[PDB]
Design a binder for this molecule. Structure first.
Ligand SMILES: CC1=CC(C)=[N+]2C1=C(c1cc[n+](Cc3ccc([N+](=O)[O-])cc3)cc1)c1c(C)cc(C)n1[B-]2(F)F
Ligand SMILES: Cc1cc2nc3c(=O)[nH]c(=O)nc-3n(C[C@H](O)[C@H](O)[C@H](O)COP(=O)(O)O)c2cc1C
Ligand SMILES: Cc1cc2nc3c(=O)[nH]c(=O)nc-3n(C[C@H](O)[C@H](O)[C@H](O)COP(=O)(O)O)c2cc1C
Lengths: 216, 216
């Protein structure tokens, strides 16, 4: 199932504006973003899904300067996801993680809740106090979600492309992510490709396993 | 159904050592690692898949210090992959990627290749000179590959777990990395779950969409 899905999914370079997402797939697109794994269930992310031609326009302002080639993907596609990560990891936000676990039924007795809180506060203190790469630590959790997402919509029969070529500073101001405490990382449109997408036609290229893989 | 994949996948806490992956799953292990997307198709990664008990043993040395609780996962699983990323982005890896694309037939005229090649060195030079996030860029792409991998193995009917609690320095010395020009980031075992894995039983926990998601 998944092997040939991974072998034909491709970064679409041109979208068909009229092919809109099913009312329900517009809710499973929501579902794949939430139920993705994260270091100690940190989930240090926030998502802005733009489905309107008012919302899709505000994001595409980001694709300025040397990013002009990525703007039609922002507009022509039906549903545009903007991946964001926390700037810094506060104590109350990790309190929110465990309490949500508590309500969802992961702990029998109270002892386990405290333990996880500090199993989390071990790794958190490891990165936010000793290594001082918490921003980057949290960012890598979201690129994992990106990867989870790009295979998800592909198997769901939807076209998509991941994009980093955008001016984060404006997208941060446009939706005030600096004020909330977040930073844009990757913009993934999803929709349906036009035959104006020259990548649907071209064969996939990877480097051979003898270069990339080691068996022991 | 891929949505049911995201709702039934779980971080396995105990593997059954007997149930080994079939050689076809053992040839499918490699393709998901190979055919994952990449920013400018850099693919700044290397994978060590350890398939026999002595190969699995060398990896499990990482989880010997204050990470012992994660060590049996590396021991009982059948195929253990440790994701690695390049230290620094050389010019020749940019040379081999595009040359490999040319060999697979992506460029009609030679001019298209050169355009593709430096559009790559636009992002590359930006991260190695302008941004200073030479390593962190070569790290986030493989966390993305992890994400693609974690849903692949779930949909493949396989049990898996991401691991960060390991001594990167030890495993890098163990297989003589960074001299290689690579770095361990995450260790992913995959195999089949044992009766001792009480994570398969617990209800999935996430933060509610009202917290993490904004529709515009
Ligand atoms: C998986 C598991 C294995 C064993 C031997 N037990 C359990 C759980 C259990 C309880 C709480 N948590 C918090 C937690 C959640 C996520 C992450 N994370 O992946 O980050 C870390 C920690 C995890 C597992 C459990 C329950 C509910 C009752 C009993 C007696 N047990 B257990 F027998 F101790
Ligand atoms: C993090 C990330 C960022 C990307 N950014 C862009 C981009 O800015 N512009 C673009 O045309 N493609 C972008 N891509 C698509 C890649 O060029 C593409 O995945 C790679 O060439 C392999 O092609 P494939 O998606 O068909 O496997 C990005 C991919 C990733 C993973
Ligand atoms: C990057 C990453 C690193 C992880 N490292 C560990 C780890 O070191 N030990 C562990 O028990 N679980 C680890 N996990 C599993 C997470 O705790 C788990 O994904 C999270 O609690 C949600 O659980 P789920 O995988 O069942 O959806 C890791 C997960 C990710 C994504």
């Amino acid at each position: 199932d998944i092997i040939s899905v991974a072998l034909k999914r491709h970064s679409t370079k041109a979208f068909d504006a009229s092919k809109k997402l099913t009312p329900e797939q517009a809710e499973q697109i929501k579902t794949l973003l939430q139920y993705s794994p994260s270091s100690t269930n940190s989930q240090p992310w926030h998502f802005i899904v733009a489905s309107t031609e008012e919302g899709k326009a505000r994001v595409a302002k980001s694709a300025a300067g040397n990013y002009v080639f990525n703007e039609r993907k922002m507009l022509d596609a039906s549903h545009v996801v903007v991946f964001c990560a926390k700037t810094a990891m506060d104590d109350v936000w990790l309190k929110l993680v465990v309490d949500q676990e508590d309500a969802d039924g992961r702990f029998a007795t109270p002892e386990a809740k405290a333990a996880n809180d500090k199993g989390r506060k071990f790794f958190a203190d490891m990165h936010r106090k000793d290594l001082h790469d918490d921003a980057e630590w949290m960012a890598k959790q979201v690129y994992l979600n990106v990867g989870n997402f790009l295979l998800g919509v592909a198997a769901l029969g939807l076209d998509a492309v991941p994009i980093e070529g955008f001016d984060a500073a404006i997208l941060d101001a446009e939706f005030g992510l600096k004020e909330k405490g977040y930073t844009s990382l990757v913009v993934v449109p999803v929709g349906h490709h036009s035959v104006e997408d020259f990548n649907a036609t071209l064969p996939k290229s990877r480097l051979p396993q003898n270069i990339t893989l080691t068996e022991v």
